[PDB]
Structure 1
Amino acid sequence: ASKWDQKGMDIAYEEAALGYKEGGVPIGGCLINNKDGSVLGRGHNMRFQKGSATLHGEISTLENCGRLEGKVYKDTTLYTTLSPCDMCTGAIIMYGIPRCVVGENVNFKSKGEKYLQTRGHEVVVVDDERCKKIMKQFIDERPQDWFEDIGE
């Protein structure tokens, strides 16, 4: 188990709330070193902020950590407020991030959640009410923008 999960999810939610305030998709996250709990980086979806088709919450988080030597990712945990799509799932796998803690998978979920476990990654779903509340609201008020974010 990990002692940094509360810290990790609070930060990810903090990013999601910020993104929502800026008028974008309420999905945030952060990357943490499991051994000491240091924050390698944090971020949120930037589709609307930067007119970006690739900056999902998880991707923005990884971009914010900057260029890193492959070994650095090997003992970290990626925290995301929502279960990852196939692209973000791919990012986790490609870099070898061993653990993914998910805020919730009620508002959204792809084959990536199971694929992660099939590829040997540990996935933890906390079922956080805050995350579920803000994401459901966005989906309700701006469904068209939501679908654009998941290619639908």
Structure 2
Amino acid sequence: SKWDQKGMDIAYEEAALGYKEGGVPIGGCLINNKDGSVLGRGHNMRFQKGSATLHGEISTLENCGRLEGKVYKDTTLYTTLSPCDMCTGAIIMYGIPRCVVGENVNFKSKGEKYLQTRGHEVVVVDDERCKKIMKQFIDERPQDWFEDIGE
């Protein structure tokens, strides 16, 4: 938990950057729990790259590059928004032990609790900066948001 302010700050920075670029304002970063080093950071690239899979968490993992499985085992994935079922699956597959979530007010899937069933620790920070930026996007571009969650 000692790196949680740092990780959510970086994830929010990515969400804000993505917002400026015209995309969905969701950002993340993967941090090594031991030394606080940032293995990678990213944001949703649906609009930036016409991508159906680069959600913020997925873009973050893609940006960390190829890694041996053991590296993920003592990391925390920070995401400004509670993970959808796909991102939840990614956290589970790599065995990232902790997921720190900015907010789960604008969105939540069954994945937040499935992570816990599968043994991961989930922390919801209830970060207002994250809530404000996602709420704005949802209010202004609802159709774009529904597409991002496959609705």
Structure 1 length normalisation: TM-score?
A: 0.99
Unaligned runs of 5+ in 1: none
Task: After TM superposition, give the deviation of residue 113 of structure 1 in Å.
Answer: 0.3
**Distance in 2 (alpha carbons) for counterparts of 1:49 and 1:107:** 22
Structure 2: gaps spanning 5 or more residues: none
Q: CA deviation at 1:98?
A: 0.2
Distance 2:112 2:53 in 1: 19
SS of corresponding position for 1:100: strand
Distance of 1:86 and 1:120 partners within structure 2: 16
Secondary structure of the residue aligned to 1:102 is: strand
Match of 1:37 in 2: 36
Question: SS at 2:73's partner residue?
Answer: helix
Whole-Å separation in 2 of the counterparts to 1:30 and 1:66: 13
Hey, what's the Cα distance between the residues in 1 that align with 2:46 and 2:27?
12
Deviation at 1:104, TM superposition (A): 0.3
* Identity fraction in percent: 100
- Tell me, what secondary structure is at the counterpart of 1:107? coil
Whole-Å separation in 1 of the counterparts to 2:58 and 2:128: 23
Taking the aligned partners of 1:52 and 1:100, their CA distance within structure 2 comes to: 23
What CA deviation, in whole Å up to 9, does each residue of 1:37-76 have, x standing for no partner? 0000000000000000000000000000000000000000
- Following the alignment from structure 2 to structure 1, what is the Cα–Cα distance between the partners of residues 80 and 94? 20
TM-score (norm 2): 1.00
Instruction: Kindly report the root-mean-square deviation, in angstroms, between the aligned alpha carbons of the 2 structures.
Output: 0.2
Q: Report what 1:8 is aligned to.
A: 7
**In structure 2, how many angstroms separate the alpha carbons of the residues matched to 1:86 and 1:129?**
23
Deviation above 3 Å: which 4+ runs of structure 1?
Answer: none
Q: How many residues align?
A: 151
- Superposition deviation, residue 90 in structure 1: 0.1
Offset, 1:101: 0.2
Distance between the aligned counterparts of 1:28 and 1:98, measured in 2? 19
Rounded Cα–Cα distance in structure 1 between residues aligned with 2:30 and 2:71: 11
User: Partners of 1:146 and 1:123 in 2: how far apart?
Assistant: 24
User: Shift of residue 131 of structure 1?
Assistant: 0.2
